[PDB]
Each structure stands twice: as structure tokens, then as C-alpha cells.
Design a protein around this ligand. Structure first.
Ligand code: EVF
Ligand code: EVF
Ligand code: ZN
Length: 257
């Protein structure tokens, strides 16, 4: 229905998802001079030692690496968060060239891509209930710039030709998402939304300040995926990012001075 094409992209989404023009939409531009250091924020606790990846899926708009979220294995806590958020999946947004691809921007700078690690608040019991609540999800966002290769990304890269088209999946067990993190966990945070339909306003965004570096060859492989299904006219999966939305009555807080 919706997508990132020439006729169904972000500027059209509001016609079927009117919350697209809402008061807490994501992504946003992070103005680094306006974001205030908040001494009351805590260090993030990223606890992925027991993560169980299961499968990788091309869903027609990105690829999702899915985790076993049937109990508290990989969780996110601390930072701006109360309680425990379970990792359900991660995916990326990226561009057709290195000068665009991220959803969040930093002083209007676009990165080549952006990783989203999606977690749901276990106090609501299941993901479907969590997305109906203003504190239902926590998404950890990590920028990608092009430079040296990211060793921990290569296993993802190498499975992509097996899920080229929409609706294809493959086994993807024993993947360690810790290999996708930067050194520092300094972050910005603000209340927002899902960045694809249904655009629900249920997310506490935690965006890391430090980008990870990936190689040109790695991101080039992202750009060989297809939005289309098998046998259909080839549409390269590129520019699957929503642009920055109005900040409205929101404050972006920094965990660092
Ligand atoms: N409003 S939307 O979900 O982005 C959407 N755009 C289009 C364009 C052509 C046909 C169906 C739909 S559904
Ligand atoms: N791109 S994101 O805000 O991380 C995100 N959006 C959506 C939409 C529907 C279902 C899951 C997710 S996760
Ligand atoms: Zn995303």
C-alpha cells in the first residue's frame, strides 16, 4: 500500500494514517545546541549477552532480524526508561548514495544509514498491547557512516542475497547484536513514534551520539535488496527512510555534557 516510491511515499501516508500529522511523530532533527544535558538521566543498560536471534525477513520495506522475545533475554533498561524492554527485532534505513539514508538527522546532517533496535515494555505483556501505550516501546537508534568495515555486520550482509525479495526469510540464529554497537553509549532522547505505518505514538527514542563505521561494500549490499516480490519488476530497496518531522512541543535531552 504505502511505501517509499514515487507515488506512495512518506508525503502520502497521512491519507491512510492520519496520525502522520500528529504531535509526536518521528524521526526529528536533533539540534545539538538546543538539546539540554539532563543530569537526571541514567546510563543506558544494554543487556544482550543472552540474545537469541532467530530469523531474517525481507518485509518489502526493510529487512528485520528477529529475536526470541518470549522471555527476558535481550533487554534494554535504564537511561530515560522505567522498567524492562525486550528486544524484538532490528532493522536499518538507508539511502541510494552515502549522503542520505538516516531518519534522524544531527544539525541537519544525514548519515548513510540508521540502525533501529526495537524493544517493547514487558509491563504490557505483548508487543501488540505495548504499541497502544505512550511508553510501550523503546527504540535504540544508531547512525552508520561509511569508512572502515564493521566486522559484526558482515554476517548480516552475507545473508542478504538469500532474502532479495519481499516475503523471503532465512534462518538467522546465533547472531550477536553487540557487534553493531559503537564504543560510547552517550545518547539523546525524546518521545516519538514508529517511523513507518501505523506511525503509532508509542516510542521512547534513544539515539546514540557516536555513529558506527561500515564499509562502502557493506552498504552497497544493502542497496541490492528489492522492495518487490519474486519475479516482479525490480525496484531496488533504497531510500527507505522517512524525513524529519516537526518537533512541536517536545524536548530532546542529552545524557552527556
Ligand atoms: N496513504 S498511503 O498508505 O501512503 C497510500 N498511497 C497509495 C498510492 C496508490 C495506491 C494506494 C495507496 S495507499
Ligand atoms: N522504524 S521504527 O520506528 O523502528 C518501527 N516502525 C514500525 C512499524 C510497524 C511495526 C514495527 C515497527 S519498528
Ligand atoms: Zn526503523
Amino acid at each position: 500500500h504505502w511505501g517509499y516510491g514515487k507515488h506512495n511515499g512518506p508525503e502520502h501516508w497521512h491519507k491512510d494514517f492520519p496520525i502522520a500529522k500528529g504531535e509526536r511523530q518521528s524521526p526529528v532533527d536533533i539540534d545539538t545546541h538546543t538539546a539540554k544535558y539532563d543530569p537526571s538521566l541514567k546510563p543506558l543498560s544494554v543487556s544482550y549477552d543472552q540474545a537469541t536471534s532467530l530469523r531474517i525477513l525481507n518485509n518489502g520495506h526493510a529487512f528485520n532480524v528477529e529475536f526470541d522475545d518470549s522471555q527476558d533475554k535481550a533487554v534494554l533498561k535504564g537511561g530515560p526508561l522505567d522498567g524492562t524492554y525486550r528486544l524484538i527485532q532490528f532493522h536499518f534505513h538507508w539511502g541510494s548514495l552515502d549522503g542520505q539514508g538516516s531518519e534522524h538527522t544531527v544539525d541537519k546532517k544525514k548519515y548513510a544509514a540508521e540502525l533501529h533496535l526495537v524493544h517493547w515494555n514487558t509491563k504490557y505483556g505483548d508487543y501488540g498491547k505495548a504499541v497502544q501505550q505512550p511508553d510501550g516501546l523503546a527504540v535504540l537508534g544508531i547512525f552508520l557512516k561509511v569508512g572502515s568495515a564493521k566486522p559484526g555486520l558482515q554476517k548480516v550482509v552475507d545473508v542478504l542475497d538469500s532474502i532479495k525479495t519481499k516475503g523471503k526469510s532465512a534462518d538467522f540464529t546465533n547472531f550477536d547484536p553487540r557487534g553493531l554497537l559503537p564504543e560510547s553509549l552517550d545518547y539523546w532522547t525524546y518521545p516519538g513514534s514508529l517511523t513507518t505505518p501505523p506511525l503509532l505514538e508509542c516510542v521512547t527514542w534513544i539515539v546514540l551520539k557516536e555513529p558506527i563505521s561500515v564499509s562502502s561494500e557493506q552498504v552497497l549490499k544493502f542497496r541490492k535488496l528489492n522492495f518487490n516480490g519474486e519475479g516482479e519488476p525490480e525496484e531496488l530497496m533504497v531510500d527507505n527512510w522517512r524525513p524529519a518531522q516537526p518537533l512541536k512541543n517536545r524536548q530532546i535531552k542529552a545524557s552527556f555534557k
